[PDB]
Design a protein around this ligand. Structure first.
Ligand SMILES: CCCCCCCCCCCCCCCCCC(=O)OC[C@H](CO[C@@H]1O[C@H](CO[C@H]2O[C@H](CO)[C@H](O)[C@H](O)[C@H]2O)[C@H](O)[C@H](O)[C@H]1O)OC(=O)CCCCCCCCCCCCCCCCC
Ligand SMILES: CCCCCCCCCCCCCCCCCC(=O)OC[C@H](CO[C@@H]1O[C@H](CO[C@H]2O[C@H](CO)[C@H](O)[C@H](O)[C@H]2O)[C@H](O)[C@H](O)[C@H]1O)OC(=O)CCCCCCCCCCCCCCCCC
Ligand SMILES: CCCCCCCCCCCCCCCC(=O)OC[C@H](CO[C@@H]1O[C@H](CS(=O)(=O)O)[C@@H](O)[C@H](O)[C@H]1O)OC(=O)CCCCCCCCCCCCCCC
Ligand code: SF4
Ligand code: SF4
Lengths: 76, 193, 361, 110, 147, 55
């Protein structure tokens, strides 16, 4: 019966840590890789704010990502 | 005497503030436009139709008249002929060009009488050892690069091969032509009325 | 929650001399602030290189990490492994000390950066005044980097650097003075808790003076005189190679995140999602000991601090590529001829408005 | 101020290296054959180079100390070094460094 | 997978001639050359576009003709075989000599087959040819990739 | 498609569209066409499919 709030707060900020440095940074990579050459000025500012806020999380899984252009069908 | 100086000071300060606000707005606007960067390693810029790249040499067409050696600004192309004695025919033994000394002016390609010498679109020459830039008669043909036939490069036309009114060549359809009609098309239209 | 309470209690549960537990906790915030300062430096370098590229229809670093995220890491690790040079007749001990005296007091001023209440290292009684006093040691560092060089190129740069850092210290103090008039005090938490329903709307001139003075701390291309490449090669930095140069490269961006956070807390407030949040009694939350509401409002306060710090970091590294440079004499006329008179005028105006209308001041 | 003739694998100065500095002197003419180790040296070859340097600085010098004459001495020293390398007294370093044959490629003496 | 063991060296010793597919930014294959060099193998890269028959340059001799520029009438040099001369100048405890070719894309299928066949004979001699391509540093035996 | 023949280019996605040249060399399935025009004879390599042996 570990329904104690002393454990539930540990659970909630242990989930918050993962959301901050494991989950939302990947969504930021995805979103900011999708809308980069088409974003407006304010959207660019918001994207850079998003990188600023989650930088500690973006650093951790940065080495595990390739943004290379995915070789194309040449004959076509 | 003293009020004119102050009104000039105010008319200068407010002007300097407006002319900074305008530049700030212009710069904050600039970051909405698509970057013109031609991201070279994966977005190589396809060269023109007259681009003077590495020289190409067809050993079979050379007659060893040495005009390439004579119109060269620095007499660069080494031609080693022996003049066989069948009736009069010169024989070619070794043709070479030190591309480390080369100037890429293509005077040699302009005055080759036998179309034995040509220019290519290989601008990607680079070595760790300059002594490897001296091209044999065989290392010169080698069937040039053709940036377009590369599975990891999205070719990008330059300003002279983009349709009318188009300035950048990044977001381009798959059916663009250079600027206008070719001469054969204009003559064909003139042929029918 | 009061993580300090839990830490000291759980550490005293197994003995360990309760008074000693309070000594075993200081490293925790003293390195949490170091962590956030280093991440802020990495963010500032990345933002500069990626925003200057967007402004110029370009692309910043993209082949280091996914988005050039690893670009500051690479630029730092390189400077770590670089051979350090010490020229022929230069001094040996003031050389390796300039870049450290220009850095230590820039880090030490992070004692007073709140990031929400009870979320700062030891809200001090001197607070912003301690920062005004500590920001006066860097000129000693620049004079030290210039005096310990056999290069007359760089002594002239150290002098014109130490003469600019003292020109923008009187207006930078006269703006904080007008803020402390309203704030009833000097501690940053006590300065910000006067925003209970923002000082920018009542100090519209002191804000301008503070911001200009902070940008003119040998920081931004509006001025950046000792870094103005064209007129002179790097000024005093022209002889530092490895980590000694990275200390300059680093002590100039931390001195920018610091100023952004300080403008935030002085004129805007590291709290207060704009509505008077703590009047969220409409959800019947017992904040007092609510185990969560506490963490929710903590996250809201951190986000609201970082939004307004990023606003000013963005605006500074945007003005870097918008405002043309001034020689050195059009610079020393901002202070002492425009910023000092306007600072005094703002102080007298705040005094007159506080004596006449003691409400709202 | 210094007066020097600095090229690849020859560095003539006009001072005395006391511990790593240079200290212009107006009569020392220091020499620093092959600092970057393009070649591999022997005890006899370095002695030959020093002897050539001495007979080049001493036996033929009554002229000014302009940088022109310093270059003129360095050029002769480097021609001597190239001759040593041609005869085979020394050779390229072959180490994992840049390895660009600045004095010529290896040939077979036909 | 962001960090590599020594499978590259084992695969090179097995096949003899590999064909890299490095990404077109050129900073992620040097570590594989360093792995090769740490085992005992010595490398020498020579930028394939610029070699001759590949049999006169690697196995036999060949007369290099430098750039006379109006002066110094045509002279030949006859530089020694770029392989048989470097197999003699190996360090004392050397496991072999692998040949690195940077721009392998310029060569032809005939020259690739020749370089593959040359590995079986001439024992202490392996070959790596950076044929351009994939966005990860993958390899494949050079006997394959052709025909 | 053999060397020496005069060919034209039929590929709308190429900068050398509807150009005419002469085949200089063919290896490994790809050809090399020389366009004699302008001033300097150009030589570029096409696939065997992006040509047409004009009469
Ligand atoms: C490079 C830059 C970035 C690098 C990241 C930094 C490295 C650290 C990585 C670890 C991240 C995991 C931590 C999870 C965050 C949740 C913890 C939290 O919020 O804890 C908050 C508590 C709250 O403290 C208590 O807070 C109480 C109430 O909140 C108060 O807080 C303020 C003071 O008044 C407000 O005004 C508010 O109204 C007020 O009530 C009382 O003040 C108590 O006195 C006080 O002890 O403090 C605490 O332990 C917090 C102490 C740890 C600090 C770490 C915070 C990191 C920021 C994460 C933000 C996430 C944002 C959303 C994530 C998901 C994406 C959407
Ligand atoms: C035997 C060998 C031993 C050797 C020891 C060495 C080993 C080291 C041990 C492990 C290393 C861990 C390092 C970090 C752990 C985290 C500790 C922590 O969580 O420490 C918590 C600390 C402490 O403050 C908190 O303070 C409150 C308590 O009040 C008291 O707390 C303070 C201390 O008293 C103040 O004095 C306050 O006024 C006082 O009243 C809270 O409720 C907690 O109790 C208390 O811990 O948090 C704070 O200090 C606030 C500072 C953090 C704020 C975070 C904002 C985060 C920034 C956003 C992140 C993204 C940034 C990227 C972009 C940046 C761009 C600008
Ligand atoms: C106040 C406190 C502050 C203290 C300061 C903190 C200091 C931190 C120092 C550490 C920083 C290191 C960051 C490294 C990031 C990075 O490598 O870039 C990512 C790049 C990107 O390319 C990658 O490469 C892959 C392609 S490929 O196969 O390499 O070609 C592919 O994944 C894609 O290209 C890309 O993902 O990876 C590489 O290119 C190859 C480099 C290999 C890196 C080595 C792995 C890390 C090991 C650490 C050592 C552990 C030892 C034990 C291991 C057994
Ligand atoms: S290619 Fe032309 S110029 Fe050169 S030798 Fe042959 S015929 Fe003469
Ligand atoms: S490109 Fe210039 S230098 Fe080279 S062979 Fe032709 S004319 Fe001579």
């Amino acid at each position: 019966m570990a329904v104690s709030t002393e454990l539930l707060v540990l659970g909630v900020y242990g989930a918050l840590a993962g959301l901050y440095l494991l989950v939302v940074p990947a969504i930021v990579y995805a979103y900011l890789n999708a809308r980069w050459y088409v974003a407006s000025s304010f959207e660019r500012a918001f994207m850079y704010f998003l990188v600023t806020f989650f930088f500690p999380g973006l650093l951790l899984l940065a080495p595990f990502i390739n943004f290379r252009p995915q070789p194309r069908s040449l004959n076509s | 005497k003293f009020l004119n100086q102050i009104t000039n000071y105010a008319k200068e300060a407010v002007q300097s503030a407006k002319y900074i606000g305008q530049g700030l707005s212009v710069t904050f606007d600039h970051m909405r436009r698509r970057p013109i960067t031609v991201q070279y390693p994966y977005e190589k810029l396809i060269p023109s139709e007259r681009f003077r790249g590495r020289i190409h040499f067809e050993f079979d067409k050379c007659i060893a008249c040495e005009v390439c050696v004579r119109v060269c600004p620095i007499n660069l192309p080494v031609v080693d002929w022996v003049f066989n004695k069948e009736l009069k025919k010169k024989e070619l033994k070794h043709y070479s060009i030190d591309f480390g000394v080369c100037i890429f002016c293509a005077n040699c390609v302009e005055y080759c009488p036998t179309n034995c010498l040509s220019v290519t679109e290989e601008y990607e020459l680079a070595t760790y050892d300059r002594h490897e830039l001296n091209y044999d008669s065989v290392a010169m043909g080698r069937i040039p690069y053709k940036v377009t036939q590369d599975p990891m490069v999205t070719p990008i036309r330059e300003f002279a091969y983009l349709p009318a009114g188009v300035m950048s060549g990044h977001d381009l359809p798959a059916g663009a032509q250079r600027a206008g009609e070719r001469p054969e098309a204009i003559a064909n239209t003139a042929k029918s009325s | 929650i009061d993580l300090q309470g839990q830490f000291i209690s759980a550490l005293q549960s197994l003995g360990l001399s309760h008074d000693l537990a309070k000594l075993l906790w200081l490293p925790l915030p003293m390195l949490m602030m170091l962590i956030v300062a280093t991440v802020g430096v990495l963010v500032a370098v990345w933002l500069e290189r990626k925003i200057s590229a967007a402004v110029q229809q370009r692309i910043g670093p993209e082949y280091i990490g996914p988005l050039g995220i690893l670009a500051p890491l690479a630029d730092g690790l390189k400077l770590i492994f670089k051979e350090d040079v010490l020229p022929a007749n230069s001094d040996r001990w003031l050389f390796t000390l300039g870049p450290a005296v220009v850095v230590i007091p820039v880090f030490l001023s992070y004692i007073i950066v709140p990031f929400g209440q009870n979320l700062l290292i030891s809200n001090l009684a001197m607070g912003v005044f301690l920062w005004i006093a500590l920001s006066s040691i860097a000129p000693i560092g620049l004079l030290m980097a210039g005096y310990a060089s056999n290069n007359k190129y760089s002594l002239l740069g150290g002098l014109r650097a130490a003469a600019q850092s003292i020109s923008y210290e009187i207006p930078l103090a006269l703006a904080v003075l007008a803020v402390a008039m309203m704030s009833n005090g000097l501690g940053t938490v006590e300065i910000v808790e006067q925003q209970s329903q923002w000082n920018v709307w009542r100090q519209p001139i002191g804000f301008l003076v503070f911001w200009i003075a902070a940008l003119a701390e040998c920081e931004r291309l509006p001025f950046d005189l000792p870094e103005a490449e064209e007129e002179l090669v790097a000024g005093y930095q022209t002889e530092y190679a490895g980590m000694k140069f990275a200390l300059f490269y680093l002590g100039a961006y931390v001195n920018l995140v610091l100023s952004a956070l300080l403008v935030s807390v002085l004129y805007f407030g590291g709290w207060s999602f704009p509505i008077p949040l703590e009047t969220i009694a409409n959800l019947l939350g017992v904040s007092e000991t609510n185990p969560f509401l506490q963490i929710a409002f903590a996250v809201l306060g951190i986000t609201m601090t970082l939004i307004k710090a990023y606003f000013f970091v963005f605006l500074a590294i945007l003005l870097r590529w918008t405002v043309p440079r001034v020689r050195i004499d059009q610079l020393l006329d901002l202070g002492w001829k425009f910023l000092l008179p306007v600072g005094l005028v703002n102080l007298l105006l705040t005094a007159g408005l506080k004596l006449a209308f003691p409400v709202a001041f | 101020m210094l007066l020097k003739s600095t090229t690849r694998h020859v560095h003539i100065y006009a001072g005395h290296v006391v511990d790593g500095e240079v200290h212009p002197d107006t009569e020392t003419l220091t020499l620093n054959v092959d600092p970057d180790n393009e070649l591999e040296w022997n005890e006899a070859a370095l002695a030959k180079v020093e002897a050539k340097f001495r007979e080049l600085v001493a036996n033929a010098a009554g002229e000014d100390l302009t940088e022109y004459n310093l270059r003129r001495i360095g050029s002769d020293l480097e021609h001597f070094i190239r001759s040593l390398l041609m005869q085979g007294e020394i050779g390229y370093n072959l180490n994992s460094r840049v390895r660009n044959y600045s004095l010529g490629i290896p040939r077979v003496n036909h | 997978g962001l960090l590599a063991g020594y499978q590259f060296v084992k695969d090179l010793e097995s096949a003899g001639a590999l064909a890299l597919f490095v990404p077109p930014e050129g900073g992620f294959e040097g570590r594989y050359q360093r792995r090769l060099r740490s085992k005992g193998y010595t490398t020498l890269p020579m930028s394939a576009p610029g070699l001759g028959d590949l049999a006169a340059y690697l196995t036999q001799e060949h007369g290099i003709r430098p750039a006379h520029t109006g002066k110094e009438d045509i002279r030949v040099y006859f530089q020694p075989p770029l392989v048989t001369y470097h197999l003699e100048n190996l360090p004392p405890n050397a496991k072999g000599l692998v040949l690195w070719l940077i721009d392998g894309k310029r060569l032809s299928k005939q020259e690739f087959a020749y370089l593959a066949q040359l590995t079986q004979t001439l024992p202490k001699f392996k070959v790596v040819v950076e044929v351009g391509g994939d966005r990860v540093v993958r390899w494949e035996p050079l006997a394959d990739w052709v025909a | 498609i053999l060397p020496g023949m005069t060919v034209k280019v039929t590929n709308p996605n190429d900068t050398y569209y509807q150009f005419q040249g002469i085949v200089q060399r063919i290896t490994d399935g790809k050809v090399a066409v020389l366009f004699e025009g302008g001033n300097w004879d150009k030589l570029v390599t096409f696939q065997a499919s992006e040509l047409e042996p004009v009469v």
